């Protein structure tokens, strides 16, 4: 079943992890169309592959900025891990390459937009709607964690809706293959586990805390800890007191109390029964986990789609020239990319 699947999945992952694909396209092979999104580190553009006419989403990282923001090892992690993984709810990396100035990761284009934009516009998701997305994240973390991968940036901005209404996780920028503790201060403020904020060594349990934040935000329409500035948010997270909307079901509150749990001996996901504490929780009782994996469940909604290269489900961004210096930057640092 899942055991045999995960075993084969690890065999497949390790082969790619040990022999990563490198230099599999070139910038001139793509027509750049429009910026789909930006973050702290990269710009992602809709591009069209000239030879096939396929559309893709191309993440562009300026090498010099990666260095200034101390993201060199993280960016090498990002590409090495994304090229090696394979799961129904993980975005596919199709090509990667670099030039004098930039690093490029060419992904499948997920046209339905960020979960973030739908969530903010609609206000909040009903519990069955939130549950459908949450189940996909549960299965995805089960897969990533079985490969010794921590994800470390779960948030609606990093979750895309595909044409069938299912989730595609993007942004593997903080993904790391690690068997023991790790210590890097990274993530997004609203989603950080208390042990990250308090500079403890931490583990994959921080992804399960972040799932608690995600489910809360999806079902409430706002995060469980919010403020005007990150320092204020961190105070609230470490305080740890959560209040729930009146409309939250008893089962949802119980699940969230077990995910947004400061005590690592008690946090679901982290215990002897592993992910099954979550899968068998009452809030998920109606969830058919195999049907979700097989993408046979009818999705809560289907994004509007007007054409292959339509970007209506994404906000507009100021466009910035892709400049390529006549001199190689940071050659040694990104040799393996």
């Amino acid at each position: 079943g899942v055991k045999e699947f995960l075993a084969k999945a690890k065999e497949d992952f390790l082969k790619k992890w040990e022999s990563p694909a490198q230099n599999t396209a070139h910038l001139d092979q793509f027509e750049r169309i429009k910026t789909l999104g930006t973050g702290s580190f990269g710009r992602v553009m809709l591009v069209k592959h000239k030879e096939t006419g396929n559309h893709y989403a191309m993440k562009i990282l300026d090498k010099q900025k990666v260095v200034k923001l101390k993201q060199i090892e993280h960016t090498l992690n990002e590409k090495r891990i994304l090229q090696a993984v394979n799961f129904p709810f993980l975005v596919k990396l199709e090509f990667s390459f670099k030039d004098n100035s930039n690093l490029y990761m060419v992904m499948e284009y997920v046209p339905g937009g960020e979960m973030f934009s739908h969530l903010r516009r609609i206000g909040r998701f009903s519990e069955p709607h939130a549950r459908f997305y949450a189940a996909q994240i549960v299965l995805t973390f089960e897969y990533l964690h079985s490969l010794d991968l921590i994800y470390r940036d779960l948030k609606p901005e990093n979750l895309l809706i595909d044409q069938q209404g299912y989730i595609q996780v993007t942004d593997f920028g903080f993904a790391k293959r690690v068997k023991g503790r790790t210590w890097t201060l990274c993530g997004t403020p609203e989603y950080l586990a208390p042990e990250i904020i308090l500079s403890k060594g931490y583990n994959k349990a921080v992804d399960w805390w972040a799932l608690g934040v995600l489910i809360y935000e999806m079902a409430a329409g706002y995060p469980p800890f919010f403020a005007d500035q990150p320092i204020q948010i961190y105070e609230k997270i470490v305080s740890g007191k959560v209040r729930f909307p009146s409309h939250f079901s008893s089962d949802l509150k119980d699940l969230l109390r077990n995910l947004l749990q400061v005590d690592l001996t008690k946090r679901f996901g982290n215990l002897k029964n592993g992910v099954n504490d979550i899968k068998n929780h009452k809030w998920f009782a109606t969830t058919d986990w195999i049907a979700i994996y097989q993408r046979k469940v009818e999705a809560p909604f289907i994004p509007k789609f007007k054409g292959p290269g339509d970007t209506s489900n994404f906000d507009d961004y100021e466009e910035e020239e892709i400049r390529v210096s006549i001199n190689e930057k940071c050659g040694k640092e990104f040799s393996e990319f």
Partner: peptide, 20 residues
């Protein structure tokens, strides 16, 4: 309401990652 307080807050738009 909590919703009103969130909507009036300065972090209702897209949130980028932190570092350092």
């Amino acid at each position: 309401t909590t919703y009103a307080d969130f909507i009036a807050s300065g972090r209702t738009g897209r949130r980028n990652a932190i570092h350092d």
